Amino acid sequence: TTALVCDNGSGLVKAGFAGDDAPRAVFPSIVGRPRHQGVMVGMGQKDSYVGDEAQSKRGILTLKYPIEHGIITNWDDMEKIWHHTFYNELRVAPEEHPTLLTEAPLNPKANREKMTQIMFETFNVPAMYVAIQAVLSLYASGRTTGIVLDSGDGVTHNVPIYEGYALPHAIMRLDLAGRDLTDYLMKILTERGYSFVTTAEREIVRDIKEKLCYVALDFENEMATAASSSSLEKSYELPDGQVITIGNERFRCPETLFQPSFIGMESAGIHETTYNSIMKCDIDIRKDLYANNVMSGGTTMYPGIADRMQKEITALAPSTMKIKIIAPPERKYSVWIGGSILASLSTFQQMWITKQEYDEAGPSIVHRKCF
Template sequence: MALREENFVVLHSGSWVTRAGINVTDTNKPPSVVIRSLVGARTISQEATQQKDEDESTHPSPRDDATKSQDNIDVDAKETASEATKDDSVAPEDTPNTQTVYYCGNALTEAQQQFNQDELTLTSPIREGIVRDWGAMEALWRHVLFRELGIKRSRNASPVLMVVPTDWTKEEHERITQIFFESFNVPGLYLAEEPLMTLYGCGSVTGLIVDIGHNSTEITPIIDTQIQRHAIQSIPLAGADIDAHFLQLLKADTQLVKEYGQPLDLEFARHLKESGVCQALSGDEKESKARVTAEYNGKEFTVGAARYKAVDPLFNVDLTGKAVMNVIEAIHAAQLACKAEKRITLWESIVITGGSCQIKGLQGRIQQELEKSLAVSENFGEYQIRDVRFLKVPDYFPNLKDSIVHAGFLGAEIVAKLIFPDPRNYINKVDYNEAGPSVVHTKTF
């Protein structure tokens, strides 16, 4: 079966956000699906399920999104514990008389309004960069493919390029392969590593990827398309630490607290951070004494100088209480682990990505901190670093050139266009039927 570009799917699940898109004919576009990597689980009895089905046959309910519409009313939309292992602290274990129903996306929003906390358990399938709940993970992927992208499982003609972190194990790769072929009926699968896709999206094959995620920051050197695994640095310092520190700063802003009139929480701080209020200062930039107006949950208020200090934990770990390297030290460690003759190219090809990279001025602050720490000499040696430069999405992608956060998705789309036309480049059904999940170790990356 010839695969067509309009059916190619790119899927990337992070610990905070899942991005996906179908049709790579035009790569100059952001992902069509961007949803929280959050899943709700509810255990119901088989009797309740049977009664619900009887009621919905005459009185359809919008809640149907959570079960049968995830797979276009395919029987596979109902998840059970026998199909995937669950973390007992997240979703109650199924018994012969019970069944776990998962909710994602808009269906999750609706379920949160309809069920109390005792009935609906929320979980992030990926925590600390590792899949902790495979049942919820499969439900999230199923929702994206069949609900958001509208693919029909029974006649699935959409191969999937799955973007994965560098530290996922062989066992995790095999499990992904099994799920996509046996549960989702995909005609083809290719696993691509996230830092390499980000570098491709910036039009380069050598560079240093600084991915500031939600729970961790990973620094990955890549030389001539080869990930330098021995040099990767991963530190538990990232967006969540920015949120927590920013929240404390906001709580100390008495004028804001008075204007808002309600207790401040992490969601409040995270919303402000993502709304563009925050800014990292570098060089001769000065704080503005003027307060800026912001809005949350329909309430307007003003934010003061706290917005300039939100990113400080990335550079001063004492603010977090963690005994780890800061981002600048981790970048140096990754660089020093590479061959000396390659370091100059890496210093001139840095990519700052991840959710927090969108904070205004963050790249400039990182550049300033890096330049401070470089050796200064009037007599430059052969391998002495002269400049720190950053890569971005090329200008010939006008819709994405200012969105470095989508560089990885762009790179994955480009790779999909190259590998899926030839069955020798990806795992197809024949390969899977002959070798099983272990084929992923011979036909990927």
């Protein structure tokens, strides 16, 4: 049967069938519950909503993400999300289809173990596999050598790979991503008098961020330009028809990727983390890593982020090293695309964790068979 691929990200579920070129089910990994008084009977209204229904009814619901920082924190809501993905979005019987899952590196192993247990015992899949997202992204690029910067929401991580060999000691992880950016934007929007507090307003601010925010090539020059003139100001219409105008916040928001101190984090910026990951690697592969910086994830979709990244890594790296940033279109889905490629490889069909192997070894099997 055709394998399932579910890139169960912190913010969005990307799910589909292996061999397809894009996921057919993309929806927020969010579960919503009503927070207000139900007064009208006979309406068949439910006590829990998931995905696009939660977004549509968000004004009446409290929205909660069961996965935070790439770590599943609410297993009942995660099970509800997976059940939705299988039965309502894909409209498939999971017991027929091998399912390829994925997770960020340096994650708690109990998360992987419980994922395997739920997949095998609740949804009764015949086979399962858990891949590291950056490896799938590198699969999607068609390459075998490169350092992948994957950044969705929740977690940002770098994985250097050379000739198909990963350097796990050089893997670097940063718990700073699109959700932290959304929260920071909510914070700084208070400077202009716009107050966004609720989770639905957090979704509104996320939409604002996606639509209007961009990465400054030179942060101080852009700040001076915004102080000088209104040329950078943009207007956004709220769901109730109220219009807000956003200025330097547009690039101050993503700047926290390069200056995590804006949100009080001591961590080095994304560029310095990439450079340090490269420098932890053997000297001989660094040139090829410099030329194959692969960007992945939704938070790499900010306009100008590739140019800024190239500039900073060029400033860090020795002269005459050829810094190249590969930021292809549709890199939002590169993890899922690589998962589809991998799951459809003939050589991969022996890598699956089978129901038999799980019945023998239990959920510990993932630590043996999965990277």
